[PDB]
Amino acid sequence: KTSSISDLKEVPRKNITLIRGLGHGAFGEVYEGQVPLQVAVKTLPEVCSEQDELDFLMEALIISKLNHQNIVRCIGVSLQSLPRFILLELMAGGDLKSFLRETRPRPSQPSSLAMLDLLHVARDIACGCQYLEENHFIHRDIAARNCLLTCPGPGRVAKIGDFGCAMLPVKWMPPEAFMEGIFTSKTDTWSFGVLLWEIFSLGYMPYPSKSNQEVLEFVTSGGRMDPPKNCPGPVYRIMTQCWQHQPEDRPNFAIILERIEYCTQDPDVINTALPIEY
């Protein structure tokens, strides 16, 4: 069951001010705004399908139903004025993939990021995924590009963001999703493993030098990514487990969370140095 419209907090359009843009979303743009409350503002184009009107509504109902610290909050909507708005928790840290690429250790900044930083992002997202799984939501697009950070700094929190064939994220998909269009919580588990690789590679594209079709054939045949540079064995082990061919053999997120937490306890894991790009 979805939220009802009455469940949505409609904010008076006058209380809402757009401060500046943040890019073009899938449908419409996204802005930084304020209602004093900082918000991200997703807009629906006034020129749109009756279908888009439905899609936009159903987005608000869905995200509004979710209540977890590691999932981006829906603060409210403004659907009674045009153009229509969905108001989201503002995430000043931006997306995880960009952050990892921007913040890679360099000779000038050898300690811009530690292994513990990566483990904490992994734990954050695993926690949100466990919440999705226990509440029977399937995300379908778990990937570093869809995780957001509260800030760049040391106390950053990572959260799962937007839930909106050549478009299919095949490099993040298990074979049953690939081949059969089957999606389950075990689907997201596989994707989470690719996310782990993204994280510990410090923001590389999965399956370096392979195209979508090349990855499809590689994975179907049992091929899997090698460990990222300097990746601790316990972390790589978690990856390979999420990439078991049969979904029944992949861990649920409860188990994944426990294994990540155990990794953070291991001094040998967290004291591992990250590679420095030359």
Top-tier CATH class for 1-90: alpha beta
90 marked ligand binding residue: yes
Q: Is there a contact between 143 and 112 (Cβ–Cβ < 8 Å)?
A: no
Q: Helix 185-200 and helix 233-242: axis angle, to 10°? A: 150
186 marked ligand binding residue: no
162 marked ligand binding residue: yes
Q: What resolution in angstroms does the PDB record give?
A: 1.9
Peptide bond into 83 cis (omega under 30): yes
Q: How far apart are alpha carbons 157 and 160 in whole angstroms?
A: 10
**Segment 266-270 long-range contacts (CB within 8 Å, at least 24 positions apart):** 266/232, 266/234, 268/232, 269/115, 269/119, 269/232, 269/234, 269/235, 270/114, 270/115, 270/116, 270/119
89 marked ligand binding residue: yes
- Structure-determination technique: X-ray
Domains 1-90 and 91-266 in one fold: no
Q: What is the end-to-end Cα distance of the chain in Å, rounded?
A: 52
How many alpha carbons fall within 13 Å on the CB side of residue 215? 19
Alpha-carbon dihedral angle through residues 183, 187, 191, 193, given to the nearest 10 degrees: -170
According to DSSP, the residues that pair with 30 across neighbouring strands are 42
| Catalytic-labelled residue, pool 141, 226, 249, 266 | 141
24 marked ligand binding residue: yes
Q: How far apart are alpha carbons 85 and 74 in whole angstroms?
A: 11
State the fold for domain 91-266.
Answer: Transferase(Phosphotransferase); domain 1 (1.10.510)
Q: How far apart are alpha carbons 240 and 231 in whole angstroms?
A: 13
Longest dimension (CA), the chain: 57
Query: Where do the structural domains in the chain lie, given as residue ranges?
Result: 1-90, 91-266
The residue type of 158 is: A
Sheet strands side by side (includes 94-95): 94-95, 147-149, 158-160
Identify whether 124 is a catalytic site residue.
no
